[PDB]
């Protein structure tokens, strides 16, 4: 039958984007005309395909990952993108064939005494691969030293919070975000639109 | 467009002992563990007296305090010491750059009220041979820094003709001085007769003008 | 493991040079960290400059972008910042610092200064004791040192027997590029006929050594 878009979009609890969240989608029809939600800040730009007539296509298999970030960082969720989220927390491939879809939710994910409960990773030696997941919470070494689990100098926790009120700029209101990825293989095509 | 950061007040004198508060604005709302506070002493490099707009660094008297979030972060230093007078910048360390400063706050020492003894000087007749005037107003052992010199060449208030530079604060009686200097062509300079410079400052009741004519 | 940041390679060049400074780090290792490079421009505030990633992005102000290059040499442990068609606004301390809760670990500085003028030694001209009347029996009197580059110029007052009294200024660049200052000092109104006043003026970089005698005029 239909596939469960609405489970991953208007889904309640979002992830942090460090431990970004991936749906695998498969076996349903996908109906991509109501995944506008006319929320604030709507963001629906595609790479190698047109978002119309995109009901037509038929793919084996779509991804959707689903995280929180800050308004400005919605840029870094692109093909070929450096920063803070890019970097270290959320990586496309330079090929990337698929769709992101942003909007702003300073509604849901704001208190006015701050919401630090969403997280993103400072600290990381190398850049992340395309689609990889660091959830390690291992403590920072930045010294020549060993931290041993302590934080100190030379010694961070990899991850901060993100600091939500509902006062802040558009900029650093929180952001929820999926990304809709398009699989296709030799192998049947499991995800379609009407015809 | 960009986060700007202002610091008021840009000057501010106290005393030994006093308790002291310094604001950083953001131009918007901004997460409160971007600010970091810096604070400079003249020929030395800055040194970081908070992060996270409230946590103490490392090594850090303990009079010092910063809290704030949104637009508004301050800076407090409980009991001032000797050693507190410098220049303290406010700084916002955010996820993506420009990193961006405050344009700081300069901590002077506070002392009674003192009236600059004024002086000019008509350019000398060396230099008046190498086909340049230069006239220089002083203003001597003031306080406070705040002070305004007007040149004045036969009556007319010369505008974008002049430099000013004002010295540190004295080690000894905590004052300032300033040197103003008036430049012009040889051939200007002779072309007028009178020649002023003229004074506004707390300590006088009313402005100042000394003066000398072309030709004693 | 003293921890600290040693730079060098600062200098003085005509705008449209290159220059390379170099900010070597103990105490921690620069390869793994976030390394700032900002800059301060005189009686100015600071300004940051470029920053690199510990994985490896890169990101520069506006005012410096495609003509600096910020990057490290992991086995020397070092940082660079690489600075080409230099211009006169360049001209500032310029510091690395690294970052993770705030800037902790700051830099000594180093000097850049990008000027199209030449190094000239100053001219000394005396500005006399009033020749018309007196505040009450305290006279000024004073040196001007005018048209030199660079910073800095030394001012003494006769060989070092006269301190106390004594202002020397801060120099103003000129809109011709170069610096000019200013030495006064206080003194007594009757020593303006028996005692001799002589300012004494070095500058390093011309090489220069002037005594000026000052007097009271006609």
């Given at each position: 039958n239909?596939?469960p878009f ?5 889904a309640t ?6 431990a970004?969240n ?5 076996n349903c029809?996908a ?5 506008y939600?006319?929320a ?11 978002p119309?007539?995109?009901?037509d296509?038929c793919?084996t ?16 969720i692109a093909?070929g993108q450096?920063?803070n989220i ?5 990586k496309?491939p330079d090929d990337?064939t ?10 849901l ?7 630090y ?9 190398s850049?992340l691969?395309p689609?990889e997941?660091d959830?390690?919470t ?8 060993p931290?041993?689990?302590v ?7 990899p ?12 900029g ?5 975000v ?16 009407p015809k | 467009?960009?986060?700007v950061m202002?610091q008021?007040p840009?000057?501010?004198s106290?005393?030994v002992?006093?308790r002291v508060?310094?604001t950083c604005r ?9 600010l970091?506070?810096?604070?400079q002493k003249?020929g ?8 996270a707009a409230?946590?103490?660094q ?10 704030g979030s949104?637009?508004?972060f301050t ?11 410098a220049?303290?910048?406010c700084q ?11 344009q700081g706050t300069?901590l002077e020492?506070?002392?009674?009220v003192?009236?600059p ?8 007749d ?12 002083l203003?001597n ?5 705040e ?7 036969d009556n007319?208030?010369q505008?974008?003709?002049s430099?000013?530079?004002?010295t540190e604060?004295?080690?000894?009686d905590?004052?300032?001085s ?9 051939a200007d300079?002779?072309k ?5 410079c003229?004074?506004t ?6 402005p100042?003008?000394?003066?000398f004519?072309?030709?004693? | 493991?003293?921890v600290?940041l040693?730079?060098?390679g ?5 705008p ?6 170099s900010?070597?780090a103990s105490?921690?290792?620069?390869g793994?960290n976030?390394?700032?490079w900002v800059r301060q ?12 990633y ?5 990101y520069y ?8 290059t910020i ?9 660079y910042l ?6 006169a606004e360049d ?8 970052e993770?809760?705030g ?6 500085g180093?000097?850049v200064?990008v ?6 030694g100053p001219?000394?001209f005396?500005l ?5 009347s007196?505040?009450?029996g305290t006279a000024?009197?004073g ?6 580059f ?8 006769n060989s070092?027997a006269?301190?106390s009294?004594?202002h ?7 809109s011709?590029?170069?610096y000019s ?15 001799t006043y002589?300012?004494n003026?070095?500058?390093k970089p011309?090489?220069?050594?002037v005594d000026?005698?000052v007097?009271?005029?006609?």
């Amino acid at each position: 039958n239909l596939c469960p878009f609405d489970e991953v979009f208007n889904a309640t609890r979002f992830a942090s984007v460090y431990a970004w969240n991936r749906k695998r989608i498969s076996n349903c029809v996908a109906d991509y005309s109501v995944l506008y939600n006319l929320a604030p800040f709507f963001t629906f730009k595609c790479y190698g395909v047109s978002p119309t007539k995109l009901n037509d296509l038929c793919f084996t298999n779509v991804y959707a990952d689903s995280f929180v970030i800050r308004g400005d960082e919605v840029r870094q969720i692109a093909p070929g993108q450096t920063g803070n989220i890019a970097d270290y927390n959320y990586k496309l491939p330079d090929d990337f064939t698929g769709c992101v879809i942003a909007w702003n939710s300073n509604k849901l994910d704001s208190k006015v005494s701050g919401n630090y409960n969403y997280l993103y990773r400072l600290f990381r030696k190398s850049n992340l691969k395309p689609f990889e997941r660091d959830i390690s919470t291992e403590i920072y070494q930045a010294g020549n030293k060993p931290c041993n689990g302590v934080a100190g100098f030379n010694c961070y926790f990899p991850l901060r919070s993100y600091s939500f009120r509902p006062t802040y700029g558009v900029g650093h209101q929180p952001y929820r975000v999926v990304v809709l990825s398009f699989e296709l293989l030799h192998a049947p095509a499991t995800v379609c639109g009407p015809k | 467009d960009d986060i700007v950061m202002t610091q008021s007040p840009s000057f501010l004198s106290a005393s030994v002992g006093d308790r002291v508060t310094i604001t950083c604005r953001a131009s918007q709302g901004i997460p409160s563990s971007y600010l970091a506070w810096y604070q400079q002493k003249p020929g030395k490099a800055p040194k970081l007296l908070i992060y996270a707009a409230s946590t103490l660094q490392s090594g850090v008297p303990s009079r010092f305090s910063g809290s704030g979030s949104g637009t508004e972060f301050t800076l407090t230093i409980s009991s001032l010491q000797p050693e507190d007078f410098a220049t303290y910048y406010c700084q916002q360390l955010n996820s993506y750059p420009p990193y961006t400063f405050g344009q700081g706050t300069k901590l002077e020492i506070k002392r009674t009220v003192a009236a600059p003894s004024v002086f000019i000087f008509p350019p000398s007749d060396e230099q008046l041979k190498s086909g340049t005037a230069s006239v220089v107003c002083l203003l001597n052992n003031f306080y406070p820094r705040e002070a305004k010199v007007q040149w004045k060449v036969d009556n007319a208030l010369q505008s974008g003709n002049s430099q000013e530079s004002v010295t540190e604060q004295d080690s000894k009686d905590s004052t300032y001085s300033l040197s103003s200097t008036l430049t012009l062509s040889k051939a200007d300079y002779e072309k007028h007769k009178v020649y002023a410079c003229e004074v506004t400052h707390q300590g006088l009741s009313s402005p100042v003008t000394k003066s000398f004519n072309r030709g004693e | 493991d003293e921890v600290q940041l040693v730079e060098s390679g600062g200098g003085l060049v005509q705008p449209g040079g290159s220059l390379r400074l170099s900010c070597a780090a103990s105490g921690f290792i620069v390869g793994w960290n976030y390394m700032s490079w900002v800059r301060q421009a005189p009686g100015k505030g600071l300004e940051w400059v470029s920053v690199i990633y510990p994985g490896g992005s890169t990101y520069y102000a506006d005012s410096v972008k495609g003509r600096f290059t910020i990057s490290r040499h992991n086995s020397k442990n070092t940082l660079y910042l690489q600075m080409n068609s230099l211009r006169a606004e360049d001209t500032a301390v310029y510091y690395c610092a690294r970052e993770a809760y705030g800037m902790d670990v700051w830099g000594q500085g180093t000097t850049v200064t990008v000027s199209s003028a030449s190094t000239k030694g100053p001219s000394v001209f005396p500005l006399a004791p009033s020749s018309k009347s007196t505040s009450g029996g305290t006279a000024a009197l004073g040196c001007l040192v005018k048209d030199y580059f660079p910073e800095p110029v030394t001012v003494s007052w006769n060989s070092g027997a006269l301190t106390s009294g004594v202002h020397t200024f801060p120099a103003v660049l000129q809109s011709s590029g170069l610096y000019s200052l200013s030495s006064v000092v206080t003194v007594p109104s009757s020593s303006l006929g028996t005692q001799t006043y002589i300012c004494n003026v070095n500058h390093k970089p011309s090489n220069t050594k002037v005594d000026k005698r000052v007097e009271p005029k006609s």
